[PDB]
Design a binder for this molecule. Sequence first.
Ligand SMILES: [K+]
Ligand SMILES: [K+]
Ligand SMILES: [K+]
Ligand SMILES: [K+]
Ligand SMILES: [K+]
Ligand SMILES: [K+]
Lengths: 191, 191
Amino acid sequence: VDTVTYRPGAVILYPGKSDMLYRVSSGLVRVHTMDDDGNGLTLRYVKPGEYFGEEALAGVNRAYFAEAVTDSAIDVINPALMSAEDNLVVTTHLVRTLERAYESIYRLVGKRLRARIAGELLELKDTALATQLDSGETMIYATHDELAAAVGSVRETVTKVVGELSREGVISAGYGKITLKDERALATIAA
Amino acid sequence: VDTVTYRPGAVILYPGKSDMLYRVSSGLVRVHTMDDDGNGLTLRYVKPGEYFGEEALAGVNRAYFAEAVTDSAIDVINPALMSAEDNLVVTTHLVRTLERAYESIYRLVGKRLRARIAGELLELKDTALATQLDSGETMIYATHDELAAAVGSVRETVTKVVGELSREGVISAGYGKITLKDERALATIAA
Ligand SMILES: [K+]
Ligand SMILES: [K+]
Ligand SMILES: [K+]
Ligand SMILES: [K+]
Ligand SMILES: [K+]
Ligand SMILES: [K+]
């Protein structure tokens, strides 16, 4: 139906009653909440082609926020107007999204923070937060606070681990930027 | 289509290629995996009326196990044979299941173990693991190892917390059984 643009950091959906279905056409969206200390917790990143606000399909309310991470173009969809073919597409996306939620759970319980940090950097490599340097390396735009929210940690501990991974030579750390110097080694650490 | 019965502890689905869609008609199923130490991790309990094995809809493989917790009757469904009306039902269930996955994440990151244990007992109150004593209290059949897998902890720490909640007078602990003596107080602890 209609496409709306949002600037970085703008809220798309607040917790409350459901309404329409949304799809990322371009950019990057973050579904998140707050913990009991006010610290953020990212539930998932939503890449182009992926849907959010699906609670509209079930009429259930939404308990999360959705915000634009980068400049983003979002398509707004009416669930009733959708055709059966489109419904199959959304269903396929939901299955994949639930599979990613279960992987997030497994990793929260079963992986050390360095493994979670390494996996998250590789995930962000295929998003709008990533750019290719002249060296050919991938650089990710993320602060240590944004990483902490994505892996369920706190800034201070993420900073320590970024320091360790820099000393191991697998990343080069910057100011709100992290260059992936050895993506094979990152995959090994992440597993 | 067809309905199959499984005894307690029997494996319904192994990790591998997807096939059919499954629904619990009676009983209780557990979707789970193993961590890096061999310890179990429950992803969710599946109650009567709820679906599992949805990866069949998307043709993706399954990375989890599904097992019968109690004596259970499971309906096997062919995704292609399904009608559009049935597809809407499964889609609604998926949305709710994803909402429960996100709540699981939030609680793993943001809640202390006593809060997670208390919330889980109240969740199991409406399952086949629950029975009503003559006193009117609800009793749950669960070992401390089964609780640890449901809240992402280890047995030894769950045992300590069960001891604390017993001394606070909110449960009465038994051998593979826990009686909910004060469900209001449990809800307060869980929040
Ligand atoms: K750790
Ligand atoms: K930073
Ligand atoms: K390592
Ligand atoms: K704790
Ligand atoms: K026990
Ligand atoms: K408390």
